[PDB]
Structure 1
Amino acid sequence: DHRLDDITARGVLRVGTTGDYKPFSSRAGNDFVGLDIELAADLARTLGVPVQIVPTSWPTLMKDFGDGKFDIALGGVSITPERQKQGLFSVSYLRDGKTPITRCENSARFQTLAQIDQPGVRLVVNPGGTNERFARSQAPNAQLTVYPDNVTIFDQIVTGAADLMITDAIETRLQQRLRPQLCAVHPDTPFDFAEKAILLPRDVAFKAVVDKWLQQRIASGAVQRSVDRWLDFPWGLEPLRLAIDQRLLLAQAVARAKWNVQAPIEDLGREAQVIQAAVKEGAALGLPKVWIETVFRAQIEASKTVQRELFAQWSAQQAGKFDDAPDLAKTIRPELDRLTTQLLRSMASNQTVLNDEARKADVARAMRALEARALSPQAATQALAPFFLEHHH
């Protein structure tokens, strides 16, 4: 039909993605990141429009596409017969095995399909894609379990509620990194292969445009380089980001409570105590005192920044008391301390990447998009400054 003219007229390429499939497509706060998101952005550039990322889900992908919610879809989308009934696909930009991931101590036990396809084997899968279809077809005798959340379904292999999952080789390699109790089973020599591509409208001329762009990306080596980059991306920083974000948003509560009782924003004595306590808690995780002080001074400054900006608004508006004011000592402070514990724990888990000065641009990518940035750009910047600065991107 006329997809490219449709796009140019709209002034935007709309791109559906689930954001739950690292390394292709993952939420990092308010942003989506990953190999397929960078592809989307580069296609938009080539088409001469800005990109808009439209959230979907694996169970609603095809309905949302048929409903016209986006132009194209990607984020680890495999070519399948079902999807080919409804749209076209780009050329494939990644061929990858189907292979197991299991607890390392069970590597030997699930080398083969014979070993896996048996009652008393607890195989888990994502609903409604190539993995579910492979499991039902090739391991019919195993016990299958369907789990909606792909962002946590590996939890069940780790804890021993399931024995293994057969998935894309690339997901096995990444999850083996991210979840050290797990091991990819022979990813280079898999049971079968599948192809990743971009889901497109039924418009042959648009597909020709996409394939010319995509084939250049493949043949130039850029897709491969992007695969390695995203496989080595610091995915494990998300808990740290969320703790920082959640701790900072709570400053709104702090400010309403203080406004109601005419409490000063800054209390350097309290602040010193909070920092002390964080240093002591962090030392138990092996974190150095100076890094903890830098981080926590920044989180305290960012909180004050929120409070000041809110007081300045309430001042000019002549706001009275807030009916919604939680107890500072009884409700807010316990929450702040809980979030301090998560922040420290995340710092310890991610200490390697966070103390590598050469990887600040990836740390920026992972952490930048706080919900709190909508509330106070300056406070979000201050809170994140121990980890990266704006010129890190």
Structure 2
Amino acid sequence: STLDEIMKRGTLRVGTDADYKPFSFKDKNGQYTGFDIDLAKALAKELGVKVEFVPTTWDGIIPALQTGKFDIVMSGMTITPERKKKVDFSDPYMTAGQTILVKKDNADKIKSFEDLNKPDVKVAVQLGTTSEQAAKEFLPKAKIRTFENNAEAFQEVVSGRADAMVTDSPVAAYYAKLAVVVVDEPFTHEPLGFAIRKGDPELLNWVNNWLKQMKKDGTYDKLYEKWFK
């Protein structure tokens, strides 16, 4: 099993996309930081081993997992049917739903999605994300502005070039640092789990028991309230 390989090697090689705030990213000087990062350190403390983050492209992070470049994937990965065909997921540690970020000035007169389905409304999204899809299917009449990252869209909604922005709930919760304000959309959400290789119940159940215990003692709630307010 990979578990024995880890406890023998003495290090937990964690594969991640070091550019997916606030789950995993770089700091002022090369080091790693994020929710999944602290979680990775916690699991590495559970194993009793050191931590080694292996930065990999989001596109080729699953084949890298399957080729044994690292033992586990922790990068806010969404559990999808297409991915469960390739890799096994652990039990959900985070729930990412669709959330709109707006200015505090517009805290009133805004109920839900349909309140922004006007053609004079300007919303911003990150290109290629599910937030873009949600902004398409639920806000078609409004102008859609796509950007490289969520920070640029956030700048656009803060400055005034955008009435709102559409992003994931953890991201929107993170950017609340407070000036703007958060509105959640009621429909459905997405599960987030860690990813390991096929045919390894030992590591899987270890991860699940460790997560269960971290939710049982309350450490997970501490780490959750730390990052997502």
Shorter-chain TM band: 0.7 to 0.9
Which runs of structure 2 are paired with 1:122-137 in the superposition (5 Å)?
Answer: 122-137=122-137
Counterpart in 2 of 1:225?
A: 222
- Whole-Å separation in 1 of the counterparts to 2:67 and 2:140: 34
Counterpart in 1 of 2:171?
A: 171
Task: Report whether the alignment pairs 1:207 with 2:204.
Answer: yes
Task: Report whether the alignment pairs 1:25 with 2:21.
Answer: no
Residue 216 of structure 1 deviates from its aligned partner by 0.9
Counterpart in 2 of 1:69?
A: 69
Residue 161 of structure 1 deviates from its aligned partner by 3.4
Which runs of structure 2 are paired with 1:103-252 in the superposition (5 Å)?
Answer: 103-108=103-108, 110-177=110-177, 180=179, 182-185=180-183, 187=184, 190-205=186-201, 206-231=203-228
- Whole-Å separation in 2 of the counterparts to 1:122 and 1:30: 36
CA shift digits 1:149-202 (9 cap, x unpaired) = 245441122123333223333332331225x2x2112x4x74432322212222
Counterpart in 2 of 1:351?
A: none
Higher relative contact order (CA 8 A, sep 6+): 2
Quickly say closer, same or farther: Cα 1:85–1:220, change in 2 above 3 A.
Answer: same
- Whole-Å separation in 1 of the counterparts to 2:146 and 2:83: 20
The structure richer in helix per residue is: 1
Residue 43 of structure 1 deviates from its aligned partner by 1.2
Extract unaligned runs of 5+ from structure 2: none
Task: Report whether the alignment pairs 1:45 with 2:45.
Answer: yes
Could you tell me whether the CA contact under 8 Å between 2:44 and 2:50 is conserved in 1? yes
- Whole-Å separation in 2 of the counterparts to 1:152 and 1:62: 28
Supply the AA of the counterpart residue of 1:201: R
CA RMSD of aligned residues (A): 2.9
Quickly say closer, same or farther: Cα 1:208–1:141, change in 2 above 3 A.
Answer: farther
Bigger shift: residues 80-89 or 37-46: 80-89
Could you tell me whether the CA contact under 8 Å between 1:99 and 1:191 is conserved in 2? no
Tell me the secondary structure at the aligned position of residue 124 of structure 2.
strand
Could you tell me whether the CA contact under 8 Å between 1:59 and 1:128 is conserved in 2? no
CA shift digits 1:266-323 (9 cap, x unpaired) = xxxxxxxxxxxxxxxxxxxxxxxxxxxxxxxxxxxxxxxxxxxxxxxxxxxxxxxxxx
Residue 126 of structure 1 deviates from its aligned partner by 3.0
- Whole-Å separation in 1 of the counterparts to 2:58 and 2:110: 27
Residue 74 of structure 1 deviates from its aligned partner by 1.9
- Whole-Å separation in 2 of the counterparts to 1:35 and 1:79: 17
Quickly say closer, same or farther: Cα 1:57–1:143, change in 2 above 3 A.
Answer: farther
- Whole-Å separation in 2 of the counterparts to 1:87 and 1:17: 15
Could you tell me whether the CA contact under 8 Å between 1:101 and 1:184 is conserved in 2? yes
Quickly say closer, same or farther: Cα 1:204–1:143, change in 2 above 3 A.
Answer: farther
Residue 24 of structure 1 deviates from its aligned partner by 2.8
- Whole-Å separation in 2 of the counterparts to 1:57 and 1:122: 31
- Whole-Å separation in 1 of the counterparts to 2:146 and 2:61: 17
**Higher radius of gyration, 1 or 2:** 1
Quickly say closer, same or farther: Cα 1:117–1:7, change in 2 above 3 A.
Answer: farther
Residue 214 of structure 1 deviates from its aligned partner by 0.9
- Whole-Å separation in 1 of the counterparts to 2:107 and 2:75: 28
Residue 50 of structure 1 deviates from its aligned partner by 1.8
Residue 135 of structure 1 deviates from its aligned partner by 2.9
Quickly say closer, same or farther: Cα 1:32–1:195, change in 2 above 3 A.
Answer: same
Residue 40 of structure 1 deviates from its aligned partner by 0.5
TM-score by length of 2: 0.80
CA shift digits 1:21-73 (9 cap, x unpaired) = 44432321221122221210121222233211122354554454455433222
- Whole-Å separation in 2 of the counterparts to 1:106 and 1:4: 51
Residue identity over aligned pairs, in percent, reads 34
Residue 92 of structure 1 deviates from its aligned partner by 0.9
- In the alignment of these two chains, the number of paired residues is 227
Quickly say closer, same or farther: Cα 1:47–1:195, change in 2 above 3 A.
Answer: same
- Whole-Å separation in 1 of the counterparts to 2:135 and 2:161: 17
